[PDB]
């Protein structure tokens, strides 16, 4: 697997809020090791049977948590991610949507110099079927297995999950890198993790319009990823210079089209299923 396993201890920033409460309740029931949460002002109380702290450092000191999940509103998110990096947290999963691009521009530089991994922001999710679930996803369509999945989309991932669970194939770990234009981690970052994961036998790459991250990934795949890869790009029928939901879903200056990405991948040896119905199918091939 990658990023997380049964041992990952997780704290939650924005834990006593609606989404943090709800999703922690989920992570908890999935067996995920939520060891606590952080909410400035509510330190000293307990929520979901776990301890609630005033600062991330207090939390890390008290629990040894190494990963943090963030459900803090956009306006306060940069402060949140930075507090986490400062506190020692090594893996951050930022669910928050709507973080200003210029904030992510800075946070990305910080994460990189600081040797911290961030999945997100904007609804990513990480789940290692069987061991750990940090996210808002539906883990009863998941099946401990051999397929590694990276996607800029939450719901599109679910489809792929079901298809691999249905072909019995299973999922090593599923990573939702989020929908923003500057994410904490991108395809190449996670692809490398899958290439090195003994448990991951096949990789399903899920892109969409905008950016050239897929194209860049293709090239990386073509020279460093030996395991088989099945890729699907959403948004072939998307209009240009129009945001398709995701802050990052947008074809700017006629570049980053769904076809370009398909092309790039195909040119790197990637089973590109033209329909998201045939992802499970295409895996059946190469696998």
């Amino acid at each position: 697997s990658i990023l997380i396993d049964k041992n990952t201890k997780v704290i939650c920033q924005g834990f006593t809020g609606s989404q943090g409460t709800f999703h922690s309740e989920q992570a908890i029931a999935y067996g995920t090791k939520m060891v606590g949460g952080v909410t400035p002002g509510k330190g000293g109380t307990t929520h979901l049977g776990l301890p609630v702290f005033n600062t991330v450092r207090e939390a890390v000191a008290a629990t040894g948590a190494t990963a943090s999940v963030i459900y803090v509103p956009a306006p306060f998110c940069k402060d949140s991610i930075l507090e986490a990096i400062d506190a020692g947290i090594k893996l951050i999963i930022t669910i928050t949507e709507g973080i200003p691009t210029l904030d992510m521009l800075t946070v990305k530089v910080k994460l990189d110099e600081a040797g911290v991994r961030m999945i997100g922001p904007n609804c990513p999710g990480v789940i290692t079927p069987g061991e750990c679930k940090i996210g808002i996803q539906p883990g009863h369509i998941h099946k401990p297995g051999k397929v590694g999945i990276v996607s800029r989309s939450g719901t599109l991932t679910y489809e792929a999950v079901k298809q691999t669970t249905d072909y019995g194939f299973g999922q090593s770990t599923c990573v939702g890198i989020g929908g923003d234009p500057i994410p904490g981690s991108n395809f190449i970052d996670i692809l490398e993790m899958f290439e090195k994961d003994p448990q991951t036998e096949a990789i399903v790459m899920i892109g969409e319009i905008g950016g050239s991250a897929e194209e860049e990934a293709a090239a990386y795949i073509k020279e460093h990823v030996t395991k088989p890869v099945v890729g699907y790009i959403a948004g072939v029928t998307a209009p240009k210079g129009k945001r398709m939901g995701h802050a990052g879903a947008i074809i700017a200056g006629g570049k980053g089209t769904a076809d370009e990405k398909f092309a790039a991948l195909e040119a790197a040896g990637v089973k590109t299923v033209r329909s998201l119905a045939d992802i499970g199918e295409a895996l059946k091939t190469v696998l």
Binding site: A74, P75, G98, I99, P100, T101, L102, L105, T106, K108, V109, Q137, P138, S151, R152, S153, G154, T155, L156, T157, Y158, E159, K162, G179, P181, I182, I206, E208, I209, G210, G211, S212, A213, E216, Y232, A234, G235, V236, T237, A238, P239, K242, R243, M244, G245, H246, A247, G248, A249, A252, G253, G254, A258, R274, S275, L276, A277
Partner: protein, 388 residues
């Protein structure tokens, strides 16, 4: 969000950058009075819409008389300008910019965007102004120069000098260019812009740099901390349903096709659109709901999708979310009766009660299908329009 050329120029003014003297006018009288205030002609009059190529569409002209200014103002105000960058429906012209004409010696280009690939704000300059720059990049990419703002230091002057020298600027123009680079770089950061485009950045016969036109794009995600840019949003420039969906927490993007697509999640929404098209369909829109798929939200999603009279079917494709696959079915049922949806509705549910809900749908009797899969719900709505 986009701003109008006059708004970009106002902003440019506040940061001491240079632009033609002009007035945004809302009436023909205001427009004609602008001429007098500006000074001696001729004058450039400009329809203020968000799209580009206004000039080729004849929404930008140089007049020599107040009588012509007024003409142009009466002609355009209240009408829709259609350029090669707007849909055939065009955009409403509610302000006309009247500014002094300029004596253009040479036309340059200066712009900036957040480069996803380098994850940096990147400024680009070219001696190729007055032209669609995406083309200058295609044809002649050696004529485009770039610099990325270091996020640890802020824009630096050498960076503007770097671009000025590459553009072959010299003497006072080098310092003017550097000044504009720094100011535009400062507006970009302070106002959380997504885009800047001075095309053309003009060298005048009298020898100075001046922003002849200006295109600013703000990061919508930052509007909470940009109150001034917040009050400048002009909704009349956007498809009203987009503002409608947004207010309802839906993300809508109208398309040409005839099959309405209502999905939860942008990636799914796009894959769904794509799969409908894969099976001979033609997606009428992109609408992404997500979680909160309540009855009203699902009904509002319907109203919005069905406002487009060319919609001849509606494909619903849910998958998870906070709502149980059957409460979602009752919400559809009610939306169909209530909205009196007059078209076949194919539903693809997934998650809790995928069938107690797929049942409820077949049990209604309403012309609501209940697909058995994706490639299926695909073929089914594609069918449900075959010749209509």
């Amino acid at each position: 969000m986009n701003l109008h050329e006059y708004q970009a120029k106002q902003l440019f003014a506040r940061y001491g950058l240079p632009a033609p003297v002009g007035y945004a006018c809302t009436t023909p009288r205001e427009a004609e009075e602008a001429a007098s205030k500006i000074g001696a002609g001729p004058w450039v009059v400009k329809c203020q819409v968000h799209a580009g190529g206004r000039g080729k569409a004849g929404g930008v002209k140089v007049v020599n008389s107040k009588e012509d200014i007024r003409a142009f103002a009466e002609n355009w105000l209240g009408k829709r300008l259609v350029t090669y960058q707007t849909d055939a429906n065009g955009q409403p012209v509610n302000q006309i910019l009247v500014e002094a004409a300029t004596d253009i010696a040479k036309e340059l280009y200066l712009g900036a965007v957040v480069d996803r690939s380098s994850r940096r704000v990147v400024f680009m300059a070219s001696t190729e102004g007055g032209v669609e720059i995406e083309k200058v990049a295609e044809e002649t990419p050696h004529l485009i120069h770039k610099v990325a703002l270091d996020p640890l230091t802020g824009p630096m002057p050498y960076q503007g000098r770097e671009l000025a020298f590459k553009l072959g600027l010299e003497g006072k123009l080098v310092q003017q260019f550097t000044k504009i680079f720094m100011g535009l770089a400062t507006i970009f950061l302070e106002r959380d812009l997504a885009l800047i485009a001075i095309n053309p950045l003009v060298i005048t016969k009298q020898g100075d740099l001046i922003c002849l036109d200006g295109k600013l794009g703000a990061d919508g995600n930052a509007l909470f901390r940009q109150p001034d840019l917040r009050e400048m949003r002009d909704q009349s420039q956007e498809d009203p349903r987009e503002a409608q969906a947004a207010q309802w927490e839906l993300n809508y993007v109208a398309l040409d096709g005839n099959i309405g697509c209502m999905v939860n999640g942008a990636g799914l929404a796009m894959g769904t659109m794509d799969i409908v098209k894969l099976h001979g369909g033609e997606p009428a829109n992109f609408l992404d709901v997500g979680g909160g798929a309540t009855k009203e939200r699902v009904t509002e999603a319907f109203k919005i999708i069905l406002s487009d009279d060319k919609v001849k079917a509606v494909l619903v494709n849910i998958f998870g979310g906070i709502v149980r696959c059957d409460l979602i079915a009752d919400g559809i049922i009610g939306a169909v009766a209530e909205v009196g949806v007059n078209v076949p509705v194919v539903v693809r549910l997934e998650g809790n009660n995928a069938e107690l809900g797929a049942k409820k749908l077949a049990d209604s009797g309403l012309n609501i299908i209940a697909a058995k899969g994706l490639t299926d719900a695909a073929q089914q709505v594609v069918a449900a329009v075959e010749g209509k």
